[PDB]
Amino acid sequence: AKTDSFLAIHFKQAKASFAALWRRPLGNILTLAVISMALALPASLYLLSKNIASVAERVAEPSQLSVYLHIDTPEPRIIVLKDDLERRDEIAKVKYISPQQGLDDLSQYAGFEQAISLLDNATLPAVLVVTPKVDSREQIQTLAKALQAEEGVTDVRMDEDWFARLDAIRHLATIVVISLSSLMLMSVFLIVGNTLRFNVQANKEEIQTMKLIGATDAYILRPYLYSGMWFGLLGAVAAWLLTALMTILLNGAVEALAQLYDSRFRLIGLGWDESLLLLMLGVFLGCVAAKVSAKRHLKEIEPV
Amino acid sequence: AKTDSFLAIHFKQAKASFAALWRRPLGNILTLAVISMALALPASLYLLSKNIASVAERVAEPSQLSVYLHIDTPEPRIIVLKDDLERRDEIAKVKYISPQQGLDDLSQYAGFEQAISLLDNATLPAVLVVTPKVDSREQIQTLAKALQAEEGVTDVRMDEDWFARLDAIRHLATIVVISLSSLMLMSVFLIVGNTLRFNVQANKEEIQTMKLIGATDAYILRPYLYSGMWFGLLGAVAAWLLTALMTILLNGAVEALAQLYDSRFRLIGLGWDESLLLLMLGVFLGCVAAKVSAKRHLKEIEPV
Amino acid sequence: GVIRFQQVSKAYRGGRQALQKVDFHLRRGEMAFLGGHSGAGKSTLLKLICAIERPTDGKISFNGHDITRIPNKDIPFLRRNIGIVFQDHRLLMDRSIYDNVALPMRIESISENEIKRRVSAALDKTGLLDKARCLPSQLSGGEQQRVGIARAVVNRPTLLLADEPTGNLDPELSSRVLRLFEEFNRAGVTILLATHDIHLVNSRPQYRHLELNQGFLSEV
Amino acid sequence: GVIRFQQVSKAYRGGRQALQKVDFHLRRGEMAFLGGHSGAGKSTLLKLICAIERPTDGKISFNGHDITRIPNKDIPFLRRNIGIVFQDHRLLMDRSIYDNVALPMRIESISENEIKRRVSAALDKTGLLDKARCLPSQLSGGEQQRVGIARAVVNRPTLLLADEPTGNLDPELSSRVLRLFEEFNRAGVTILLATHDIHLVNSRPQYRHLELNQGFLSEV
Amino acid sequence: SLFAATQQELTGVKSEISRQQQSLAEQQKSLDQLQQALKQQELGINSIENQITKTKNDLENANRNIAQLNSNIQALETQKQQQADKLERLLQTYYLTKRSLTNGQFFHRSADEDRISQYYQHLAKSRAQAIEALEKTQTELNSNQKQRQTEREQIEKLLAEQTQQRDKLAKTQSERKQTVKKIESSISGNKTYLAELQRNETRLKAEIAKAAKRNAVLMNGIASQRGKLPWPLKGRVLHNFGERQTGQIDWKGLVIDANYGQEVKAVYPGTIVFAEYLRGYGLVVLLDHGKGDMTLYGFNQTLLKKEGDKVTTGETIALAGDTGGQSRPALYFEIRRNSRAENPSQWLQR
Ligand SMILES: Nc1ncnc2c1ncn2[C@@H]1O[C@H](COP(=O)(O)OP(=O)(O)O)[C@@H](O)[C@H]1O
Ligand SMILES: Nc1ncnc2c1ncn2[C@@H]1O[C@H](COP(=O)(O)OP(=O)(O)O)[C@@H](O)[C@H]1O
Ligand SMILES: [Mg+2]
Ligand SMILES: [Mg+2]
């Protein structure tokens, strides 16, 4: 008895399943649109996050280390400490700010044209800054901290991501990312399941007859697997198109803002490597959801 | 042959529809969670948009210039100086803040109630606000220098007047909010319809039996309308709770940020009016989606 | 009369004609057998009478009111007057027997107490009062058919239509089901039974017999 | 033999027992009628034989291979050997007749040309070759039943099971269907027909008759 | 009848003698009651005087605490003014450099945001520390002032107590003078006074004998210090040893005029053997110098030393007074050797 090869049956099933979507255009189009939008949401969020991160990195990437001396230290000892720091290695470049200079800086920051009065000369402690002579950030930071501790410096505020801190980036950003990822997974993993359950229900009699005759379970299941795979792939493509359209929409608004600031900037779309990952994620979610939901719903359908 | 009251049948149908959700826990729970998340996200986006708009409106002041008189300056001298400044050209208007009015403004902030009481006689300098007639920065600087040299002041403070940057940021936020809100509303509207279609397909036999008997169309349609309404209500309530739980965290993060400086800031949450509108929108969307989907799928079912 | 036809004929889309110039009249209280062959128009006639499918040539009168072009919004009111029994004894396996028999009443939104009393009366009349709280799966075939008849007749229909109600039962239960239909007719409910079993119709010649042959009704 | 039972009995969850100590043996080529009453175990027997429901007491042997505890993964291979005919003539209305009759072959993933030739042969044997490209809706009841028989027998089954195949046909077509089954038996296909019609079985006494009564099989 | 007159006359004389004895007994009983009343009055005056001195000492102690509290309050006021000025200027600086976010006062262009934030945080921390210290010092000052006011109120109570004691002492002194006057008027009879003097002198010997047999002082005695003993008190001698005090009773010691409250200094070191109130001598302090040599100091208003206490030469043992019914303050000095009274003039330095 002649039997088709392993690949021929799979290719026929794929083509037939793709052709089957046109039997119910509206039902299979609304689900595709929903999947596309649900997958495009996180894509656009990631795009904006990447753009802002690139802007932040681009603005400036120098390295400077600041050390705050204790208020208790008197003025004459400041010169001695400056000389000692200069003598030691890795301290080639040093700048010192007098308390009067700090007061002037503070007055300028608040918008006063001239240094504010009635603050006295003891408003702020003296501050010194040391440039990083050694490229080793960790070793340089450790050495600076040890030196400051030896000299009795109250605080050692080495340059770092103060804005990121442990409040916004540590918690809020992670929570938002987790929430968006969960929404993406549930929305895609849900609507795909319901559509395939509905399709299986619409073919109750055919499945009953097929099981009665003696068809194997895998033969029953495969068409829905391929339908889900097609759903995922088409949804991923639609999501990519939607993100591209959104970037086109925001190009002008971002250009207006970037022009005003010094840094001239332009929106950048998803990289060509990212598109492959997007398609892989779409097809993976489609296949997994289809397999799980179709098998679970197909368990409870007896031949008679 | 007695018929129940018009309201009684509707109430019974609503109760039955609410009880129906327990038939299939997983699907109903997942769709409800997705609806809640998709209704919560636009709420948070709108909240951020409203906060940015409020800040932009506050910053709308035309770069008003503040002048501080000496603490010991006599009150008649302050009045004479204010009159002279008003008489002087290039000054649009003059506002005088009394020392006790400034004391009240300062006491508005937290942590200052105790100190003011402890001090025998708190004496803030008389703060006077002068609005330049010309918004030009050069004119502002010249007027500030002239006021400092007027020989009747101790300090002068000037504003930032960064209106354009905040306007651009507001425009960008508006575009992003509109786009994402539209996508989420479409997604939630379409997700409901699919679940209603699947539910209608589930009980095909009962619908066929009822239509074979002289059942009316409205009787068959009502339960699905009420199921959609319950979906909308529960989703909207969950979305409001999520929005509150998100605004608390956002307020905490912003307070932590502003704590770096000595000042503090608080977020303006969605008002009592917003919650009612959110519930109304959720109910309307759910009911309309359920009605359209269920009716369209119901037209295509024959008793035999 | 309870129903009358005036040269009614039906032609399917394919081009095959189930009915061609069929004319018969039913007076209230009468019973008929509507015999036919494997083809003929028995099922098509039963579908036409209850307005599931519209005619093409003639006109149909139920109680002097034309049913030829009844608007689709009035079909439920018409169907409320007609009870239908099918060979398949369509039953909702999920629900209980008391629920299946009570569906026609609940469709009209009747009070619970009246529904209970009426359903109890009907089930007692058909002899299934004892098993009113059981599922249809447990019942045997004859019990299922009797439950179907009770569900059909609960709502005091003026005309009762049976579409080969005895298809899936041996003659022993055929006699019982036919006797039950006879009792319902004695109660005053018009009936139009439909069957291709010549033996059953020949058993009882009291009721007028209409033979349907290739879409033509001899009425003899 | 083609099938053998050893004190097999089935008890439903409700507590009602369809079968109790039923024992019969079939030799290849034979035909049986399996008469029974409205209750009895005809349908339960036909369900048991094709492994749709498992037994409780005894053992079942198909060709010397125990089917009592066949793993669920081997059921399709067993069902491929058995053809089943039902009173409802289960047919897929959407597809064409050539597609309905070709489903058993396509399930095995057979080449298109062999499928075409075999389906044409089967349809010619049942006399429906002309309408191989039409939909089942257009066909009459007898034609639909013959299409069902062809679909059942296309795959050269060793044992053919019929579950009241003549439920929805008048005796005139009953004779034709029974003659078709007789021809298939002459071809060498074992058959176990099931019917409650005493007249039909009494018509042809050549084939051994097994009477099933309240779950007991007299075999006389 | 002639012989019976003598017996009858004796009965009449005996009746008169018995009546005189009964009158003398009643007079003696009245004198004893007057003596008992005077002893209570004299003891009460000494007790009242001691209480007045104690109260005065307490008042003096309070005064110094009052000065310390006043100095602490002045220091606290100076610190409060300094800290109030500091807090005022710091609060004014904050009012100048508010930097409120909602008004677009954040993120000044082209500035070291981290460093300016550190400046602001340090300023806020300094403000918090300043207000905490101000509250602490103000609370301490308020608590001290409340305690200081209570101390003044307590002083008021002490003053009230001292005033009441002074009035009682004045009343007691007047009563003692009246009691002394009554005794003197009733002692107008020469016979009665002489008998009372003998009993008091006899009482002194018994007390001296008992004290001598109790504490056997191991001192070397005052024999080697004849003619060099310092005068116990500075005053004019009123009665010399051997002078006729009343009738046939001659003074056994030296009576030296002394001012009220005058300090009495021990002539030589010794151990106190009798520091109780004796009838007819007031407060009497007996000092034993060993070898049977003892010195007695009577009429003291108050006794500072107690029985068994050691006393050094020149140490104040008691305060001169008018105890013992004396009409004027004086100190009775008597020197006894081997239970025999010796003339003090021969022992005291010239
Ligand atoms: N949906 C249809 N389309 C075309 N022809 C049909 C349809 N239904 C039935 N027919 C044909 O119309 C005729 C009516 O047959 P019918 O009265 O239903 O037989 P029965 O009473 O045994 O059920 C038959 O020849 C049947 O094949
Ligand atoms: N799913 C079931 N659960 C419990 N009892 C059943 C079930 N199906 C059938 N029965 C009972 O088991 C017995 C078997 O009857 P059956 O052989 O199916 O009659 P028939 O051959 O006419 O179809 C009957 O009494 C029937 O009521
Ligand atoms: Mg029919
Ligand atoms: Mg059966």
XYZ file of N, CA and C in Angstrom, chain B residues 1-4 9 13 23 202-203 205-217 219 302-304, chain C residues 47 52-53 75-77 79-80 84 86 90 92 94-95 103-104 106-111 113-114 118 151:
156
model
N -52.237 31.371 33.990
C -51.053 31.864 33.299
C -50.686 33.262 33.788
N -49.743 33.329 34.722
C -49.276 34.586 35.288
C -47.829 34.825 34.881
N -47.507 36.078 34.579
C -46.179 36.469 34.131
C -45.501 37.316 35.198
N -44.200 37.107 35.371
C -43.443 37.872 36.345
C -43.331 39.330 35.909
N -37.966 39.621 35.879
C -37.322 38.752 34.897
C -35.911 39.239 34.603
N -32.537 37.114 35.305
C -31.577 36.862 34.236
C -30.187 37.339 34.624
N -19.272 28.100 35.469
C -19.249 26.875 34.676
C -17.838 26.555 34.203
N -21.194 26.953 22.492
C -21.140 25.850 23.445
C -22.502 25.193 23.627
N -23.562 25.993 23.724
C -24.907 25.501 24.024
C -25.796 25.481 22.788
N -27.231 23.114 21.225
C -28.399 22.247 21.334
C -29.541 22.945 22.062
N -29.233 23.636 23.160
C -30.279 24.309 23.920
C -30.922 25.421 23.104
N -30.120 26.177 22.354
C -30.678 27.242 21.528
C -31.574 26.657 20.446
N -31.147 25.555 19.828
C -31.988 24.913 18.824
C -33.312 24.472 19.432
N -33.260 23.851 20.611
C -34.489 23.396 21.253
C -35.401 24.571 21.577
N -34.834 25.661 22.096
C -35.648 26.816 22.460
C -36.282 27.458 21.234
N -35.536 27.565 20.134
C -36.105 28.159 18.930
C -37.144 27.245 18.297
N -36.981 25.927 18.436
C -38.009 25.009 17.955
C -39.332 25.270 18.659
N -39.288 25.457 19.976
C -40.428 25.967 20.727
C -40.568 27.433 20.345
N -41.710 28.037 20.651
C -41.956 29.399 20.224
C -41.254 30.452 21.055
N -39.981 30.229 21.374
C -39.222 31.209 22.135
C -38.903 32.422 21.272
N -38.939 33.601 21.887
C -38.614 34.828 21.181
C -37.099 35.009 21.107
N -36.670 35.928 20.238
C -35.242 36.187 20.088
C -34.676 36.899 21.310
N -35.505 36.693 24.418
C -35.285 35.777 25.530
C -33.963 35.041 25.373
N -30.211 27.413 12.983
C -31.546 26.986 12.590
C -32.038 25.876 13.511
N -33.323 25.860 13.882
C -33.796 24.781 14.766
C -33.580 23.393 14.192
N -33.739 23.227 12.883
C -33.507 21.938 12.238
C -33.080 22.150 10.790
N -42.539 20.062 8.435
C -41.757 21.292 8.510
C -42.575 22.490 8.044
N -41.336 26.280 9.767
C -39.878 26.231 9.705
C -39.395 26.596 8.307
N -40.141 26.199 7.279
C -39.835 26.536 5.898
C -41.089 27.075 5.229
N -43.369 34.274 14.193
C -43.224 32.818 14.183
C -43.244 32.247 15.591
N -42.552 32.817 16.581
C -42.588 32.211 17.923
C -43.989 32.102 18.499
N -44.832 33.115 18.289
C -46.195 33.043 18.802
C -46.956 31.897 18.154
N -45.573 29.118 16.878
C -45.013 27.855 17.348
C -45.447 27.544 18.772
N -45.755 28.571 19.568
C -46.220 28.311 20.926
C -47.506 27.496 20.932
N -44.516 19.683 18.973
C -43.831 18.869 17.978
C -43.106 17.732 18.681
N -40.476 14.442 17.777
C -39.547 13.956 16.769
C -39.084 12.547 17.111
N -35.439 14.708 20.985
C -34.451 15.718 21.337
C -34.583 16.095 22.806
N -32.226 17.556 26.389
C -31.012 18.187 26.894
C -30.443 17.277 27.973
N -27.827 17.430 29.755
C -27.253 18.073 30.933
C -28.302 18.287 32.017
N -29.490 18.741 31.636
C -30.500 19.134 32.604
C -31.300 17.923 33.078
N -39.293 23.489 30.201
C -38.738 24.520 29.328
C -39.814 25.309 28.597
N -40.842 24.689 28.008
C -41.855 25.493 27.305
C -42.519 26.527 28.195
N -41.137 27.919 31.078
C -40.155 28.933 31.446
C -39.877 29.884 30.293
N -40.053 29.425 29.053
C -39.862 30.315 27.912
C -40.842 31.478 27.979
N -42.054 31.228 28.470
C -43.054 32.279 28.615
C -42.893 33.077 29.901
N -41.929 32.727 30.751
C -41.704 33.420 32.017
C -42.938 33.319 32.919
N -43.263 32.082 33.289
C -44.382 31.785 34.176
C -43.849 31.602 35.589
N -44.713 31.848 36.571
C -44.307 31.750 37.965
C -43.906 30.318 38.304
N -44.363 28.349 40.939
C -45.325 27.428 41.542
C -46.253 26.828 40.491
N -46.767 27.666 39.589
C -47.626 27.160 38.526
C -46.860 26.206 37.621
N -48.067 22.350 37.050
C -48.399 21.905 35.701
C -47.470 20.788 35.241
N -43.123 16.840 27.302
C -42.578 18.166 27.044
C -43.316 18.839 25.898
